[PDB]
Structure 1
Amino acid sequence: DKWEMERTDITMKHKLGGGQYGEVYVGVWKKYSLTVAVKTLKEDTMEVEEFLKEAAVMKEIKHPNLVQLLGVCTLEPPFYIVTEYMPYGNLLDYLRECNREEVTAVVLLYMATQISSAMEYLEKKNFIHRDLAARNCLVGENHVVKVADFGLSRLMTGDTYTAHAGAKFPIKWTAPESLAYNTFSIKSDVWAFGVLLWEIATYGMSPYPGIDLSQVYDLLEKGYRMEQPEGCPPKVYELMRACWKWSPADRPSFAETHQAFETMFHDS
């Protein structure tokens, strides 16, 4: 198809983000003097069909707050997926390092809004993300934020995705039903989005500090939730709490979350 590109066009450099994203690399598409990100299929995956399914979804996504697919190499091994490279790194590190007189509460709201626009678009396309978190959001020029879009899955709304037994999740971002039953949905992404919103509100602190991973389900089941961070507006906390409702059906849609953020700008 039109996405196939020449692998020898790419100069492969180091693993991206010091290896925290697995077999994703920084490369240069030499012709265009362009730095790109390159996900490869290495020893990790005896799962070639899965990698191809991932790429398939990416070919159907175009949004200003989702990482842009540039091409693929799947005419021979090893298979590649090639996206734009975001030069300022991930949102977690960015919040932790930033000057808070520049990254003000106004900018935090802009960040949150852009992420909720991305997720509204995925929701509408019946795609699930499964790893929404500050570490998987990327920063560009002028506080542009883009959500990473490797690892997405098709799943119609009203349907649920069941991860294989022994699949390992980022516990503190994972909805209780996903913890308990390996069951994922757009509403488990909404839950993760509330946790991301707390990461944004705290300038990238670690969630549920001092709580062991073994205790997180029991904490949530008994009705406890992370407290409102100092200076977090009540309306933003209410939204967080809506995302962490026990029943997935009671959690807002991303359409609703995005709207809430738009309204907050006018209410300001």
Structure 2
Amino acid sequence: GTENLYFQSMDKWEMERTDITMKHKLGGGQYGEVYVGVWKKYSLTVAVKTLKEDTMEVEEFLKEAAVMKEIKHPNLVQLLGVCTLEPPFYIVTEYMPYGNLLDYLRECNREEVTAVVLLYMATQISSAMEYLEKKNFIHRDLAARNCLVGENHVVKVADFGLSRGDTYTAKFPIKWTAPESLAYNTFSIKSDVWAFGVLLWEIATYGMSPYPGIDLSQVYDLLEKGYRMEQPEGCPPKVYELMRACWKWSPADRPSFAETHQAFETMFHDS
């Protein structure tokens, strides 16, 4: 009746493309076809992922829009709307003023990003992932470069979908990838836990490139023999213990994200 009369068509994520004044590409290519825009009615800066008229990735783009409508969490980047009627298609999210977590860690002032802030940042990411685990989703590409930073040290998990340097190779980011995913192409919430461990090492080292002093072609063999990255300088033993638990060889022995989020909470009680 009235609903159908007033909403004849589309869902209440759908927006008119002309609601957004597109400004300039974000990140010089590093996020793909992602632009900063202004959602005019709200004078609100937004990030807009687009897909032009001629590509092979329509289905994946539409599935991404579909997936994002089903998830909502304070530490997952917020969908604001979509344009899916005709190309070029849009997915519009909030804009995160401090950009991606890897670059933030590398470029930040460490008087401000003290130990407590690193813990807060790690805890928030583990909360996003607990929610994904609980809702039966897998991330598949968890890493500092896929997280975003907002005002007040708010961190959110994102997925820029950018398989296509030597981060991704024939396309997997080997250094973040669980053994079972490298050897068998098996991905699960447990392989996300592995990646979270590497992410935590990134946090602990303020954005160092993982496996320093190690050739990429040798990584799987080393992990299999039992090598794991060393405890970073200044890394609390409890944080390293959790890292090492995320890197257990067998996926079943790795903690859940619920357990991981519980561990970070316990570290705020203890110290």
Tell me the TM-score normalised to structure 1 length. 0.91
SS in 2 for 1:184: coil
1:212 is displaced (CA, Å) by 2.1
Q: Residue by residue, what CA displacement relative to the aligned partner does 1:188-235 show, whole Å, maximum 9, x if unpaired?
A: 110000000000001111100132221111111111010001111111
1:13 is displaced (CA, Å) by 2.3
Question: Counterparts of 2:100 and 2:160 in 1: how far apart (Å)?
Answer: 15
Indicate if the aligned counterparts of 2:146 and 2:160 stay in contact, CA closer than 8 A: no
Question: Counterparts of 1:149 and 1:72 in 2: how far apart (Å)?
Answer: 16
**Residue in 2 aligned with 1:217?**
220
1:160 is displaced (CA, Å) by 23
Asked if 1:233 is matched to 2:240, the reply is: no
C-alpha distance 152-68 of structure 1, shift in aligned 2 (>3 A): farther
Tell me the TM-score normalised to structure 2 length. 0.90
SS in 1 for 2:56: coil
1:44 is displaced (CA, Å) by 8.6
| Matched-pair identity in % | 100
Indicate if the aligned counterparts of 1:54 and 1:153 stay in contact, CA closer than 8 A: no
Question: Counterparts of 1:22 and 1:46 in 2: how far apart (Å)?
Answer: 15
Q: Residue by residue, what CA displacement relative to the aligned partner does 1:143-200 show, whole Å, maximum 9, x if unpaired?
A: 111111455999xxx99999xxxx6011111111111122111111100000000000
Question: Counterparts of 1:152 and 1:58 in 2: how far apart (Å)?
Answer: 17
C-alpha distance 86-261 of structure 1, shift in aligned 2 (>3 A): same
- Alignment map for 1:35-46 (pairs within 5 Å): 35-42=45-52, 45-46=55-56
C-alpha distance 205-160 of structure 1, shift in aligned 2 (>3 A): closer
1:80 is displaced (CA, Å) by 1.1
- Is 58-67 or 95-104 further displaced after alignment? 95-104
1:120 is displaced (CA, Å) by 0.4
Structure 1 unaligned segments of length 5 or more: list them.
none
Indicate if the aligned counterparts of 1:57 and 1:153 stay in contact, CA closer than 8 A: no
Structure 2 unaligned segments of length 5 or more: list them.
1-10
Question: Counterparts of 2:195 and 2:201 in 1: how far apart (Å)?
Answer: 10
CA RMSD of aligned residues (A): 4.0
C-alpha distance 44-104 of structure 1, shift in aligned 2 (>3 A): farther
C-alpha distance 189-42 of structure 1, shift in aligned 2 (>3 A): farther
1:15 is displaced (CA, Å) by 2.1
1:3 is displaced (CA, Å) by 0.2
Indicate if the aligned counterparts of 1:161 and 1:183 stay in contact, CA closer than 8 A: no
Question: Counterparts of 2:204 and 2:163 in 1: how far apart (Å)?
Answer: 28
Q: Residue by residue, what CA displacement relative to the aligned partner does 1:52-94 show, whole Å, maximum 9, x if unpaired?
A: 1111110011111110000000011111111000011111111
Question: Counterparts of 1:175 and 1:105 in 2: how far apart (Å)?
Answer: 27
Question: Counterparts of 1:196 and 1:248 in 2: how far apart (Å)?
Answer: 17
1:137 is displaced (CA, Å) by 0.9
Indicate if the aligned counterparts of 2:34 and 2:48 stay in contact, CA closer than 8 A: yes
SS in 2 for 1:119: helix
